[PDB]
Amino acid sequence: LPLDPLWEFPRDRLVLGKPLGEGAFGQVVRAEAFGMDPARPDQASTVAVKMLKDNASDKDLADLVSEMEVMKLIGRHKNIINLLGVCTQEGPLYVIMECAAKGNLREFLRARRPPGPDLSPDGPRSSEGPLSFPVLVSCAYQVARGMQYLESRKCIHRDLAARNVLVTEDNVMKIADFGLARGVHHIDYYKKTSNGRLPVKWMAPEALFDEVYTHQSDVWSFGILLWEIFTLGGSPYPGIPVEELFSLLREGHRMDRPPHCPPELYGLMRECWHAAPSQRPTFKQLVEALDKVLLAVSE
Numbered sequence: 001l002p003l004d005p006l007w008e009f010p011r012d013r014l015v016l017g018k019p020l021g022e023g024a025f026g027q028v029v030r031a032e033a034f035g036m037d038p039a040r041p042d043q044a045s046t047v048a049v050k051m052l053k054d055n056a057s058d059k060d061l062a063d064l065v066s067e068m069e070v071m072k073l074i075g076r077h078k079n080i081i082n083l084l085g086v087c088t089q090e091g092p093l094y095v096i097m098e099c100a101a102k103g104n105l106r107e108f109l110r111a112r113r114p115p116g117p118d119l120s121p122d123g124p125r126s127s128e129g130p131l132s133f134p135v136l137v138s139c140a141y142q143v144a145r146g147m148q149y150l151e152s153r154k155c156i157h158r159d160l161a162a163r164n165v166l167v168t169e170d171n172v173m174k175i176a177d178f179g180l181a182r183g184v185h186h187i188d189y190y191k192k193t194s195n196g197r198l199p200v201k202w203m204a205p206e207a208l209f210d211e212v213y214t215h216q217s218d219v220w221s222f223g224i225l226l227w228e229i230f231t232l233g234g235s236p237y238p239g240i241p242v243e244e245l246f247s248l249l250r251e252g253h254r255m256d257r258p259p260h261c262p263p264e265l266y267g268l269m270r271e272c273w274h275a276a277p278s279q280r281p282t283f284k285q286l287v288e289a290l291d292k293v294l295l296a297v298s299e
């Protein structure tokens with residue numbers, strides 16, 4: 001690969017740390033970087049480094065190069081994982097990105113569910129869990145803002161889900177793994193991940209049935225993500241296996257309103273799941289609708 005001086009970072013300024021996770025074509029590890037800001041060349045920061053797995057094929061390499069090029073072109077936004085640099089010369093290919101210290105939004109919510117009524121009261125806040133309604137609305141608003149940014153740069157996510165939203169130390173939501181090669185013409189719809197996820201449950205019907213993806217297909221997925229937020233990290237279509245999911249979607253089935261979810265938010269979920277993609281809100285409209293709720297409840 002040729003040297004791009006805008007982005008190239010010396011690989012000897014990285015100290016690789018513990019792995020974070022792996023995807024279809026790469027693996028991600030934490031690392032310390034020294035001098036990511038060239039004006040502070042000895043300053044340490046913690047970053048996430050994506051690289052190829054050991055068994056990597058030429059297709060895996062092309063997929064990682066494509067992701068790097070998308071990340072170069074996307075530009076910076078507060079509510080996405082941003083590219084920090086790359087290492088292409090004299091060693092393995094590294095794509096260096098921001099690291100989100102609290103992990104993904106699904107894990108963040110499930111770890112913060114409120115105390116159950118089996119716990120003995122201890123102090124004045126025994127009933128108060130970490131999560132409050134305005135903070136849940138803020139998470140949703142921030143995801144919508146990041147998706148609005150990505151849409152403005154002509155980027156379609158194609159698997160938007162709470163596990164693909166990351167959470168920083170300051171509870172900033174950052175959309176991850178956008179614009180990736182996802183093998184959309186060879187999806188095993190029955191595939192379950194190592195954590196039990198069925199990604200088919202986030203697909204808009206035009207994507208699942210017709211292999212058509214638009215920004216409005218991402219809006220459908222955002223509605224599933226909203227349901228995940230307001231169930232504190234629940235898995236969608238509870239109890240429904242994939243074979244049953246296909247038949248229910250053909251019949252127009254939608255998820256029920258979850259407990260402790262106001263009608264404003266279930267209303268937005270149902271708009272995001274309208275059958276016709278043009279009858280779903282745009283991301284700009286979702287940002288505005290969620291901002292109105294957020295402002296009302298933050299007074």
Ligand SMILES: *C(=O)c1nc(NC(=O)Nc2cc(O[C@H](C)c3c(Cl)cncc3Cl)c(C#N)cn2)c(OCCN2CCOCC2)cc1CN1CCN(C)CC1=O
Pocket residue numbers: 020021022023028030046047048081097098099100101102103104107163164166176177
């Ligand atoms: C660096 O800030 C960091 N990051 C994490 N977790 C993390 O997920 N960071 C992350 C991952 C990531 O992509 C991977 C593939 C991923 C994963 Cl692993 C899971 N779901 C989706 C995705 Cl897409 C990207 C990108 N691009 C960016 N950042 C971290 O963790 C701690 C483990 N913890 C997580 C929360 O629940 C319990 C488990 C830790 C850190 C840095 N820190 C902070 C604190 N110190 C003490 C230890 C540390 O290493």
